[PDB]
Design a protein around this ligand. Structure first.
Ligand SMILES: Nc1nc2c(ncn2[C@@H]2O[C@H](COP(=O)(O)OP(=O)(O)OP(=O)(O)O)[C@@H](O)[C@H]2O)c(=O)[nH]1
Ligand SMILES: Nc1nc2c(ncn2[C@@H]2O[C@H](COP(=O)(O)OP(=O)(O)OP(=O)(O)O)[C@@H](O)[C@H]2O)c(=O)[nH]1
Ligand SMILES: Nc1nc2c(ncn2[C@@H]2O[C@H](COP(=O)(O)OP(=O)(O)O)[C@@H](O)[C@H]2O)c(=O)[nH]1
Ligand SMILES: Nc1nc2c(ncn2[C@@H]2O[C@H](COP(=O)(O)OP(=O)(O)O)[C@@H](O)[C@H]2O)c(=O)[nH]1
Ligand SMILES: [Mg+2]
Ligand SMILES: [Mg+2]
Lengths: 440, 53, 428, 431, 428
């Protein structure tokens, strides 16, 4: 039971999506080719793999993911890499062009030719499975394939399935620096259609995951493949209450009342607490009374703004490992007495724990040392309004001459979105704080 | 010679000649590598790379 | 499936277009007979970008050698890698033409153009996903930049969104190799700016000083500067044939690059080039190579960057790198250089990092900048028409075929339409 | 439980702790890999694996002195984030030090203060170490304690110095430093820093017979004093001394918080075992001017109060015999309105001696702690050295060029002259 | 970290610059091929102060040479240790300055002082954090003093708070070297007082008389003199590279030394320097350094410190040693002279220590001092300028270049400014 769909669309999330499927196959006995390695072959007693995988009778296990992107290059190394012996080769849809950052090159001109194929697979997977729980869509916010092309594939399941959950795992646009030049303009494209459907997100950027690599990790000047593993870990902690049972486990339908107060504030943080090497884990003990605070450190949270100007609204300390529940309320009552962690005045409910009994999952080929404890922190905070304050303002200083619009109007897109979405983006930033200080 | 923007070197010889400083480079400057950690020396019994810690 | 259809024209582009195929075939393991000799795997699996495949297990290019005078095409057939091509598309004629724009588009190039474009039609109508064109020409004469507008005009009449990628060698400031050069160069600006999307503009003068100062070459012959241009040829095509971590085709390298429909001209550049003497003395990194990308000397077209603000710098990286080092050290070049970038764009740069670099060093690079400062190239050539035009100098050839002075006055404004808009947008 | 947290500041103060944390580590059975080859919990955190880590934060702006700690033989002891290094020197300039240079390192050095002390149960002090001459030994600690007075309040801070000798010193600019690390840190400070080291040089010539000491050889003895103060925290005695207890005892008035120290049974290895070091002998060996760790004349000052602290095998009827020996004896001047005089301290555990040192395994020991009515006299002529510089306003442009106002010195001097005259007010007799 | 960037200037600069990089290179164990072949461990971790790395484990010095006559440039490269600088850093002029800085900096060097910042600004932004600069010159010549007053001046604009440390050789009492020296040292003080944070003065007969009596050396050329200035060269800079009980880098001296900021000239010296024949007979102790360091034989200036009073004195005592012997020996020299130390600084005496000797001696020490009677160095230069400038004896060779008459009197009053401030602070 308790299964979920993991489509990996757009280049950023399909490459982090290449990084999750190492991690699941390591936890169980599933090899890349799906055969248990001639010993520790199950008779069939357990059903631990059913959240993310499925079984074909020969002994080979089959995953549940779909790799779609119109780019031909990036899917082509999972048909020839170390993981070609894993998927189903009808899941893999390739194509002819990239995004080229044009909204109609993912929603009106090129993405309209591929839509009967991609809808006929998410319903093909779901009829084999018993009782569904949510979606795991891996899309970033930049391009016309990351952000233009998830809005086409979010707007059709939510009229197909209706009341299913949505979860996402990718990179937020940094406020200061980026790579794609039309990215100030670009994210507001997905928010016209994917705010009444989206119930989950990612809050902050890959910029600050460089700096955890500097300090807590003992590495100097990392790549992008270190980004993919650390984002890949918190995937296996949110989805750990669906095949591994503990004290307090949450299915993915409960999060649309945990974390969404009003219909337009629906996003988490992500913070793995003991992200440290061997050379510091040997020196330091890491009990529960500090890995709760290590989540609430201004450094270790993934945020490129000040947390000290933020008031935490609905945190959710999802623990995991060898933990004992007296240590938790010894640690949370420690937290709400601390004056610097300011909260929301009209919600003393606030916290929401989750306890489980499997260790942190290492993967060989990395920095990590083994720790007995780890904890995720999905936390809806206040301060991120400052980050949406500059991103639509980043649209506003090329708004005079309307630079870069010559290809949107060139290929299949109108100007009509570019004012209505901005005031709707202005409607999103005002609504954290037009309710932020009312009942005084 | 007309061609020095693409000098005639094989990939293995290029890699082996470019990884020339064995230990002197990281001591004498911050010799960055793409995705590599820092290894302070440790005693034999004390620090294992991954053990019960 | 990000395809490119190639051509050559003029004497200047025929050579560098021929010296295109020396650089690309060494990357991909091909022997001039057409046997794959490379030992690496990745040379083959995107070979159909530039190549058809020949029956019997053999490989063959995708280009059309044409020019009006037959010495050059007969010179390349005797060349180093001459025997690679297809002999049906050499449209070479024994006849000549005297660098006159008039006859080459109304009489003498009108007989030729159907045989010229029926083989650009051949290689395209049997294609999977066509995406662009590549025509190597040069700005001066009546055959090079005369015929550059001939081989682009009838194309856009059918191809809706295909992105042409030409390469043009500009007139140098100090010297001249044609008297009637402003009288023919501005004649193609009437059509090229309407239609071209990439013109990698090249000065001949700046090509010597890189050889004099960095390379310390006293004598750069023509076997050198073609091999210097040829790097930025196959440096932009890294994310068209190879894996990489930040991939873009010629369209994404136009939606990022092109802001307004007429300011679209590219400046070449190759980073890890150094003389033989001081090569051991130099140690390269991602911080060290980013100097040679952003150096004042490593630009193939001579202008002054300190007299203009960059619109969109796009440097493609190739090799095995750290990608904080890509992004943290392409902001440090933007923070420390503040006033020389436009204030109405918050991030002025874009990287592209590949997974297999072109051969010669471990850590190669190629830097492509779209400045504003190339208006001083535009000021001198547009001046050289009008201050030579106060006496009605050379009209008695071109008026045998109907090139009236009503044309040559208004096309000069279409050069100065470009000057007025950089001044419109330098102070914004 | 009854712990402290030690922060070693400046090159004059980190180099204290290198020989101090030699001594605390060998005083337990702890090899610097952390492994033994519950009463020690006053100073160490313990992992699950069995690793010992001290409660230490090492802070300096010159990276040389911290780097020798990291690559030496104690690399396996510290968490290598406890070592906090700068990148430009403080350069004997608190206008550079606590205004410009320390203003960006101050976030890390407080975030380690909370995280080491978030673990601990209940504290009663801090241990801070510097001289009075360097810029980061004068200004940075003022920045490192005014935020500590605000963020903690009543919880004590204790300090220990090696002042360079006021007669012969290193820097010409050093009186510009030792006034403003006495002025600005006067209001915050509890039991604080000491007197000079020229008496340590002399006691390293007569009582310790070996000629030519180095800073390594003195720091053997400086760690002997401090551990005797924290001796009762790890091991029981028939009289036990808490460390908050030193506020109320040796401080007469809350602008006078510099009670001095010395250690009497210092003996060379040859002369150690011919003689008795009796209980009555060593207390009679504290109250002469020759045996002091203090290079001022005690004959000038009537003693306000003193603190005695015996280590080892002591029977307190001898202490009552030794206390009776001094008061009735005529030369020493216990002050007129204080008939109490003494704070006693005993402890069973013997004084530990580092191998390779010049000291002796003594059966008994005493660390004589006192406040004299001559402390203003060294404070008198120190401002005269400050008077002679600042008459023609010399060297001030290497401070007032950096963010600090021109007349800030004369605020402190008259404040210190408000300390000198009002100190002499208590010294007269009262009929 | 605290890294320093080198410079050289003129004929004296390249000679004393090349011998210094024979000194500090062999301190670390670097052969002239540049690759570290030494056995010690304490040399690599702070070699980044003065050395970039050439790839291959070869160590390239952070240095740059300049002269206006290119023969004096290339004497260095053919020498013993001239094969280590990168050849891109050999900037130069083509025609000699002719002992005229009316030519050396106003007219001739102005095209070169524009371009030689590009090597300077690129070697000195390749550091994480910057501490200073160094340049070695003499105050009589034209090529390396007037350019030395222009190489300093452009630096102060763009590094306004970094401690430049420029080294000088001052013109002689009795045996002049050029006829025009009062037109030089009186005029190379106008751009050296105002914009240099650290300067040392060195006379050549003091360098001769130390080679006349204390050394008793028979026939030494300009070879060993270039070690003698190099002996106190890095004696200041050793506490940057190696650990010590009581460290003192540049900014610890610069705070301590200068009482008032218009007085930044200094008298260097060197302590354990013994004769060659009588080397074996002399035991070396810590007090025996001190008496040999404060007598007027080891002063490196030909203007007597017995006739004046010291302001501030330091000394660093390199090598493993005990430090009670530092203290009362510095007490000993402080009370041995009362008249020689000022009234209103009580302790006039500073110390420092390092733990590593020079490779060639057991335990060494150096000197620095700031004396009163160095105004007689300032007077004697200023006296010989009153003689020549009353009859305008040599003005017309410098006049027509662009330095008019008033610019020799403004630097003369500023020169008479400097002799004035010593006399008012002497009597106290
Ligand atoms: N973790 C990780 N992130 C990546 C990787 N490659 C790109 N990214 C992120 O992807 C962003 C690019 O914007 P996208 O939204 O992905 O653009 P796109 O939709 O893929 O557009 P196309 O590349 O044309 O398909 C960059 O800002 C990177 O942060 C990668 O390999 N790993
Ligand atoms: N016993 C002992 N005293 C020391 C040691 N190091 C320094 N001192 C004392 O400190 C005095 C000088 O220290 P400071 O003036 O603070 O110099 P610093 O520590 O480098 O401070 P900054 O220059 O500001 O960095 C010396 O005269 C010594 O008396 C040491 O290792 N042992
Ligand atoms: N790099 C290079 N440039 C050339 C070559 N041949 C001609 N040129 C350039 O072509 C310019 C003259 O214009 P041109 O191309 O001949 O006009 P065309 O007659 O129509 O081809 C001259 O300035 C030459 O620098 C060559 O082989 N290599
Ligand atoms: N220490 C030292 N000084 C030198 C040497 N050669 C020349 N000098 C000094 O250089 C001075 C002459 O100045 P010079 O450098 O020729 O001025 P320039 O012609 O402008 O470069 C003389 O006073 C010498 O003392 C040398 O080898 N060693
Ligand atoms: Mg993509
Ligand atoms: Mg210091």
């Amino acid at each position: 039971m308790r299964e979920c769909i993991s489509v990996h669309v757009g280049q950023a999330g399909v490459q982090i999506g290449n990084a999750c499927w190492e991690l699941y196959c390591l936890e169980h006995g599933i090899q890349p080719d799906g055969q248990m390695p001639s010993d520790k072959t199950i008779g069939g007693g357990d059903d631990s793999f059913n959240t993310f995988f499925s079984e074909t009778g020969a002994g080979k296990h089959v995953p549940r993911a779909v790799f779609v992107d119109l780019e031909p290059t990036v899917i082509d190394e999972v048909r020839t890499g170390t993981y070609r012996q894993l998927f189903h080769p009808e899941q893999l849809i390739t194509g002819k062009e990239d995004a080229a950052n044009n909204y109609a090159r993912g929603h009106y001109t090129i993405g309209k030719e591929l839509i009967d194929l991609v809808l006929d697979r998410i319903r093909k997977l779901a009829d084999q499975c018993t009782g569904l729980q949510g979606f795991l869509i891996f899309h970033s916010f930049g391009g016309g394939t990351g952000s233009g092309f998830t809005s086409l594939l979010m707007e059709r399941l939510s009229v197909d399935y209706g009341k299913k959950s949505k979860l996402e795992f990718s990179i937020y646009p940094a406020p200061q620096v980026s790579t794609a030049v039309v990215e100030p303009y670009n994210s507001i494209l997905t928010t016209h259609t994917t705010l009444e459907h989206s119930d989950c997100a990612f809050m902050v950027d890959n910029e600050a995951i460089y700096d955890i690599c500097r300090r807590n990790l003992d590495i100097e000047r990392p790549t992008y493949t270190n980004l993919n593993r650390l984002i890949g870990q918190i995937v296996s902690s949110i989805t750990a209450s669906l095949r591994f049972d503990g004290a307090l486990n949450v299915d993915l339908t409960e999060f649309q009342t945990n974390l969404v107060p009003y219909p337009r504030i629906h996003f988490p943080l992500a913070t793995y607490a003991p992200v440290i090497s061997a050379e510091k884990a040997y020196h330091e003990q890491l009990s529960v009374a500090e890995i709760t605070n290590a989540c609430f450190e201004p450094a270790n949270q993934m945020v490129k703004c000040d947390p000290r100007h933020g008031k935490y609204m609905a945190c959710c300390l999802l623990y995991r490992g060898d933990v004992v529940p007296k240590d938790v309320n010894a640690a949370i009552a420690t937290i709400k007495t601390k004056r610097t962690i300011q909260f929301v005045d009209w919600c003393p409910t606030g916290f929401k724990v989750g306890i489980n009994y499997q260790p942190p999952t290492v993967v060989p080929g990395g920095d990590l040392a083994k720790v007995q404890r780890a904890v995720c922190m999905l936390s809806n905070t206040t301060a991120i309004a400052e980050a949406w304050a500059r991103l639509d303002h980043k649209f506003d200083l090329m708004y005079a001459k309307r630079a870069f619009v010559h290809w949107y109007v060139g290929e299949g897109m109108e100007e009509g979105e570019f004012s209505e979405a901005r005031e709707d983006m202005a409607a999103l930033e005002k609504d954290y704080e037009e309710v932020g200080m009312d009942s005084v | 010679a007309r061609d020095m923007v693409n000098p005639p070197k094989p990939y293995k010889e290029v890699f082996e000649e470019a990884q020339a400083g064995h230990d002197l480079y990281v001591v004498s400057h911050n010799d960055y590598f793409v995705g590599e950690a820092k290894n302070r020396k440790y005693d034999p019994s004390s620090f294992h790379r991954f053990n019960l810690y | 499936m990000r395809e490119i259809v190639h051509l050559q024209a003029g004497q200047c582009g025929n050579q560098i277009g021929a010296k295109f195929w020396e650089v690309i075939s060494d990357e991909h393991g091909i022997d001039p007979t057409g046997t794959y000799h490379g030992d690496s795997d990745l040379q083959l699996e995107r070979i159909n970008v530039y190549y058809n495949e020949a029956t019997g297990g053999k490989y063959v290019p995708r280009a059309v050698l044409v020019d009006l005078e037959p010495g050059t095409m007969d010179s390349v057939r005797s060349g180093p890698f001459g025997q690679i091509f297809r002999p049906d598309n050499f449209v070479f004629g024994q006849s000549g033409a005297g660098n006159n724009w008039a006859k080459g588009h109304y009489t003498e190039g009108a007989e030729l153009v159907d045989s010229v474009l029926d083989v650009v039609r051949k290689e395209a109508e049997s294609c999977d996903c066509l995406q662009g064109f590549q025509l190597t020409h040069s700005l001066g004469g009546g055959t090079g930049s005369g015929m550059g507008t001939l081989l682009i005009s009838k194309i856009r009449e059918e191809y809706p969104d295909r992105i042409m990628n030409t390469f043009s060698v500009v007139p140098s400031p100090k010297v001249s190799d044609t008297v009637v050069e402003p009288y023919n160069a501005t004649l193609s600006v009437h059509q090229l700016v309407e239609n071209t999307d990439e013109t990698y503009c090249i000065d001949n003068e700046a090509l010597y000083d890189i050889c004099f100062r960095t390379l310390k070459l006293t004598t750069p012959t023509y076997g050198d500067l073609n091999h210097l241009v040829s790097a930025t040829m196959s440096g932009v095509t890294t994310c068209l044939r190879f894996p990489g971590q930040l991939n873009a085709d010629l369209r994404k390298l136009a939606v990022n690059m092109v802001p307004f429909p007429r300011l679209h001209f590219f400046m070449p550049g190759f980073a890890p080039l150094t003389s033989r003497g001081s090569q051991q003395y130099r140690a390269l990194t991602v911080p060290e190579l980013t100097q040679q990308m952003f150096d004042a000397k490593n630009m193939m077209a001579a202008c002054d960057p300190r007299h203009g603000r960059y619109l969109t710098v796009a440097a493609v990286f190739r090799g095995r790198m750290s990608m904080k080092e890509v992004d943290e050290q392409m902001l440090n070049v933007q923070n420390k250089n503040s006033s020389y970038f436009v204030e109405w764009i918050p991030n002025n740069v874009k990287t592209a990092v590949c997974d297999i670099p072109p051969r010669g060093l471990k850590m190669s690079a190629t830097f492509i900048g779209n400045s504003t400062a190339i208006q001083e190239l535009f000021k001198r050539i547009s001046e050289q028409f009008t201050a030579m035009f106060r006496r009605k100098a050379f009209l008695h050839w071109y008026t045998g075929e109907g090139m009236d002075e009503m044309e040559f006055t208004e096309a000069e404004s279409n050069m100065n339409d470009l000057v007025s808009e950089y001044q419109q947008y330098q102070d914004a």
